[PDB]
């Protein structure tokens, strides 16, 4: 179930679902696992926010366990090519791929909360078949873990040596650490 | 004098 | 005319209204200046100098153009719009206002033009049998301000004839609290309020208070309000002023001769007993005067609804040679403390 | 007796940066009163009106188009406003107001009102809703006041009788803004998009001047906005204000004899002192002005309140022979230089 | 199924959701098990109400066994970000995480009903694989752990050493023993 609220405005009232009524000040949330669905969703979303104003920061609430990397990877380019600013946010925690998502958020514009976690490990995947497919299927992950370390230290500054060790395994990353390690901007803890 | 304007 | 002189001379009358009196010592040079020795110059249409005084209730507007009446040499007309009827109907005609302007230049045409001209309740006009304090008062009006030459016949009329006497020289103040014209400014100003995280939330009230909020009117506000824009268009000034201060309602009653304080004191020294008024009890009547949302008009309720067991006891009492009003007095938990 | 040669040019001294606009006024008022000073003598007899339909940006000149006509044409004008205009009988209003506003403007005209101009404001307001005495229901009533009739009028308000006045010869201008119409042109001619990946997205929101799409509009984009197509039928004639720049505004202050720059220049050659503008401190102005998103209209408001200072301690200040102003003074950082 | 209600008011009659008419009064439901998808839900209706009103206090009735930690970190930090003071009511049970957020409101404003029951343990998890993926996923179990009796201490006031011990294992607290414990700050029994 999903609450209904009153948006008041000048022509009379309207009855908006919570989800709908923030989408009107370019806020999309995003939920669950990342899949095909859920994330083809959210393309559209940054896309209607696109026409009805170019010029107004984007803000994307985060908290997800992570998902598909295909599904991840269409929204990341989505919001490089936009010109719009796409504020990021990490409520609750920030998988591989909710983290991925993070630190391509534009520059000092990104936070996290002061109990949110964050956690990055490497591309998992596998096959079963003949020796000749698996060779293949290998070669593609390596280059997907290759080419997600190369954007990760792009927008977190550090090099790409650094990110090939810290992502061997799993890898727990608090709220001060994150901004320690170049992948967040600040801490929202209070109103000011 | 008095005007008695009303609208429905 | 000094602008440095008129505004010391308002000051002793008028507190709380700085920026105000600067625009009306430039706005009333500005007009004296184009009557002299103006419309001499290189780049015609020189525009006419008006002033649009607009202030809340108990805000002195009356007082500022009393000021400059007494100050000013040239004369002043004191003519409101309340019952202003058009096309010579039984309340009053718009023409007459000209009359009263003669009797106080004694009939002088060439003293007369260089007059100065105030409304007062100009939100009554607003546009809405038939209608005739509405919009028609706004045609009569604009006619005198455009500029245009008008009969009065002199001394009424013993023949038929009347009196050609300018109107474009004639200054004129449309000044009057304007009801309700805070929510149309609010719309504009307050273009929405965000939602998420990092966008900030309004408070209450923060900028949505009187002061603050006239001062970035515009012209086309005060056209939803019912007025006509070609009425505005003749005033592109426009005065601002604030509500009140604390700090001035502890001058009022204190500076001018005509303080409440001083009232009270006359009236209990013919009956052979002193008054008295410490600080304390001042500064915190202002407390409770803002509250009210009055003004100066509305102190005097402050006073005797504290006076009001202090004057009824006082015949009766014997022996109070003096009375002290303590803080706690305008309070009202403790009773004021008597002098033998 | 003016011809469109001559009148481009007087409109050209007081308006810029819209060539388009002059060329149609120009040859529809010139044929206009062609018709009245020739009447209906010629062979052909019940010579039909051209009527004007005005398009543009809000702050475009659209009203001073047509009140500098009416200064050098020197046919009485009005300007009425379509917002408080009612369906034939409600609260708000009734149609029968504007036709007495031309009258006022002279009082008495029989054969002399019939050759005047009338202008509208916010056309757009009343387009036809579709979820009505704010929509579609006006537009009905306004079809057979342009095609021409008469309406009983008192002259000046009162003889137990009503002046017949022709409207057919009366030319009407319906002036307006049509927000949000490129998107429907948009899709119609140039391109569907704005919303996707190789659609063109609303980048050259003011790098690029959405007036050229205008050019291309025509009455049936009119019909989706919500106007009847019976009521654009009578308006043939249609006008296109493109957009307004940052360097014509500093024109606008230049070019015209009547710029606002000029005035002050003229207001202290009486008084012997000289003023000054540079160019450095006009841009500033532009930038204040297009971030208010009202044009060259909340443009006195930036002057005023800069100058305030300077006015108010000019007549005090002696031995002053210049002033030079800043582009810091216009931030209000700094305070403008005086030379002796 | 949901009931319709009719709000009365000046300009007309108006439909709503049982859900959503309280919500127009400032009051937020946590029902069932604490999960991303009901937890990213709660957090866009605190939103909303700063929007409208910060000022005025917000109420949040809790009816919940517990559930994702995660998912529940999410809110708490919320009513510590936001102005309005988050009052919190227990009704029926409160486990380890709907205990967490119901001390986690305002001071002052915490109730708890004569007949409701709160629990407290510590977190559960578990891991299958490598023994030095165990160790990382221990070591990051082990800080919430010690996170979480650490602001359990702030607001109920007591000591870390006592959460610790009281948090070993499963420890029920009926209504009289939560005001003696901090956790709570009286008891609405009747109205008055
Ligand atoms: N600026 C002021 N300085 C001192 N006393 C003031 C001032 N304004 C008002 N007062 C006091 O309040 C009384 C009434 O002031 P008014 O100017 O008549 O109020 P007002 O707002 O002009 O009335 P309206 O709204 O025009 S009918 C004066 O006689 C003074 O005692
Ligand atoms: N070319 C221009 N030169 C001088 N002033 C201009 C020019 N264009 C517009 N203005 C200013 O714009 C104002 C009129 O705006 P208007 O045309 O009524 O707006 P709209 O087009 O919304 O009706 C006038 O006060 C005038 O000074």
Same mark, same amino acid.
């Given at each position: 179930?999903?609450?209904?609220?009153?948006?008041?405005?000048?022509?009379?009232?309207?009855?908006?679902?919570?989800?709908?009524?923030?989408?009107?000040?370019?806020?999309?949330?995003?939920?669950?696992?990342?899949?095909?669905?859920?994330?083809?969703?959210?393309?559209?979303?940054?896309?209607?926010?696109?026409?009805?104003?170019?010029?107004?920061?984007?803000?994307?609430?985060?908290?997800?366990?992570?998902?598909?990397?295909?599904?991840?990877?269409?929204?990341?380019?989505?919001?490089?090519?936009?010109?719009?600013?796409?504020?990021?946010?990490?409520?609750?925690?920030?998988?591989?791929?909710?983290?991925?998502?993070?630190?391509?958020?534009?520059?000092?514009?990104?936070?996290?909360?002061?109990?949110?976690?964050?956690?990055?490990?490497?591309?998992?995947?596998?096959?079963?078949?003949?020796?000749?497919?698996?060779?293949?299927?290998?070669?593609?992950?390596?280059?997907?873990?290759?080419?997600?370390?190369?954007?990760?230290?792009?927008?977190?500054?550090?090099?790409?040596?650094?990110?090939?060790?810290?992502?061997?395994?799993?890898?727990?990353?608090?709220?001060?650490?994150?901004?320690?390690?170049?992948?967040?901007?600040?801490?929202?803890?209070?109103?000011? | 004098?008095?005007?008695?304007?009303?609208?429905? | 005319?000094?602008?440095?002189?008129?505004?010391?001379?308002?000051?002793?009358?008028?507190?709380?209204?700085?920026?105000?009196?600067?625009?009306?010592?430039?706005?009333?040079?500005?007009?004296?200046?184009?009557?002299?020795?103006?419309?001499?110059?290189?780049?015609?249409?020189?525009?006419?100098?008006?002033?649009?005084?607009?202030?809340?209730?108990?805000?002195?507007?009356?007082?500022?153009?009393?000021?400059?009446?007494?100050?000013?040499?040239?004369?002043?007309?004191?003519?409101?719009?309340?019952?202003?009827?058009?096309?010579?109907?039984?309340?009053?005609?718009?023409?007459?206002?000209?009359?009263?302007?003669?009797?106080?230049?004694?009939?002088?045409?060439?003293?007369?033009?260089?007059?100065?001209?105030?409304?007062?309740?100009?939100?009554?006009?607003?546009?809405?049998?038939?209608?005739?304090?509405?919009?028609?008062?706004?045609?009569?009006?604009?006619?005198?301000?455009?500029?245009?030459?008008?009969?009065?016949?002199?001394?009424?009329?013993?023949?038929?004839?009347?009196?050609?006497?300018?109107?474009?020289?004639?200054?004129?103040?449309?000044?009057?609290?304007?009801?309700?014209?805070?929510?149309?400014?609010?719309?504009?100003?307050?273009?929405?309020?965000?939602?998420?995280?990092?966008?900030?939330?309004?408070?209450?009230? =923060?900028?949505? !208070?009187?002061?603050?909020?006239?001062?970035? %009117?515009?012209? /086309?506000?005060? &056209?939803?309000?019912?007025?006509? #824009?070609?009425?505005?268009?003749?005033?592109?000034?426009?005065?601002?002023?604030?509500?009140?201060?604390?700090?001035?309602?502890?001058?009022?009653?204190?500076?001018?001769?005509?303080?409440?304080?001083?009232?009270?004191?006359?009236?209990?020294?013919?009956?052979?007993?002193?008054?008295?008024?410490?600080?304390?009890?001042?500064?915190?009547?202002?407390?409770?005067?803002?509250?009210?949302?009055?003004?100066?008009?509305?102190?005097?309720?402050?006073?005797?609804?504290?006076?009001?067991?202090?004057?009824? =006891?006082?015949? !009766?009492?014997?022996?109070?040679?003096?009375? %002290?009003?303590? /803080?706690?007095? &305008?309070?009202?938990?403790?009773? #004021?403390?008597?002098?033998?």
């Amino acid at each position: 179930l999903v609450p209904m609220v009153i948006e008041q405005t000048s022509r009379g009232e309207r009855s908006f679902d919570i989800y709908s009524r923030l989408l009107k000040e370019r806020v999309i949330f995003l939920t669950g696992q990342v899949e095909d669905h859920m994330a083809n969703l959210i393309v559209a979303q940054m896309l209607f926010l696109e026409a009805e104003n170019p010029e107004k920061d984007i803000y994307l609430y985060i908290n997800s366990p992570g998902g598909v990397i295909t599904a991840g990877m269409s929204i990341y380019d989505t919001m490089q090519f936009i010109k719009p600013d796409v504020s990021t946010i990490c409520m609750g925690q920030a998988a591989s791929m909710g983290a991925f998502l993070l630190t391509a958020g534009a520059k000092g514009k990104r936070f996290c909360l002061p109990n949110s976690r964050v956690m990055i490990h490497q591309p998992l995947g596998g096959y079963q078949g003949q020796a000749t497919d698996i060779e293949i299927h290998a070669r593609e992950i390596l280059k997907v873990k290759g080419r997600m370390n190369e954007l990760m230290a792009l927008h977190t500054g550090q090099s790409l040596e650094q990110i090939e060790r810290d992502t061997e395994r799993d890898r727990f990353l608090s709220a001060p650490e994150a901004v320690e390690y170049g992948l967040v901007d600040s801490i929202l803890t209070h109103r000011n | 004098x008095x005007x008695x304007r009303x609208x429905x | 005319p000094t602008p440095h002189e008129i505004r010391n001379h308002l000051d002793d009358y008028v507190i709380g209204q700085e920026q105000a009196k600067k625009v009306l010592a430039v706005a009333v040079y500005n007009h004296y200046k184009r009557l002299r020795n103006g419309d001499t110059s290189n780049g015609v249409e020189l525009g006419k100098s008006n002033i649009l005084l607009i202030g809340p209730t108990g805000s002195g507007k009356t007082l500022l153009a009393e000021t400059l009446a007494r100050l000013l040499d040239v004369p002043f007309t004191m003519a409101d719009a309340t019952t202003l009827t058009e096309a010579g109907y039984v309340g009053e005609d718009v023409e007459n206002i000209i009359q009263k302007l003669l009797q106080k230049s004694d009939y002088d045409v060439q003293k007369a033009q260089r007059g100065i001209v105030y409304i007062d309740q100009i939100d009554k006009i607003s546009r809405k049998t038939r209608d005739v304090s509405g919009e028609g008062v706004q045609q009569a009006l604009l006619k005198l301000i455009e500029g245009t030459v008008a009969a009065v016949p002199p001394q009424g009329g013993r023949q038929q004839e009347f009196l050609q006497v300018d109107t474009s020289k004639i200054l004129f103040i449309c000044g009057g609290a304007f009801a309700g014209l805070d929510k149309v400014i609010s719309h504009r100003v307050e273009t929405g309020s965000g939602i998420g995280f990092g966008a900030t939330v309004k408070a209450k009230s =923060d900028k949505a !208070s009187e002061g603050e909020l006239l001062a970035q %009117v515009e012209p /086309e506000d005060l &056209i939803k309000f019912g007025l006509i #824009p070609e009425f505005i268009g003749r005033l592109p000034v426009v005065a601002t002023l604030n509500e009140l201060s604390e700090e001035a309602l502890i001058q009022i009653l204190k500076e001018p001769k005509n303080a409440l304080t001083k009232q009270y004191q006359a009236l209990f020294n013919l009956e052979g007993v002193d008054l008295e008024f410490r600080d304390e009890a001042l500064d915190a009547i202002a407390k409770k005067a803002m509250a009210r949302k009055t003004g100066a008009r509305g102190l005097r309720s402050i006073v005797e609804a504290a006076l009001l067991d202090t004057m009824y =006891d006082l015949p !009766s009492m014997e022996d109070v040679e003096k009375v %002290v009003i303590d /803080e706690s007095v &305008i309070d009202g938990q403790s009773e #004021p403390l008597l002098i033998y």
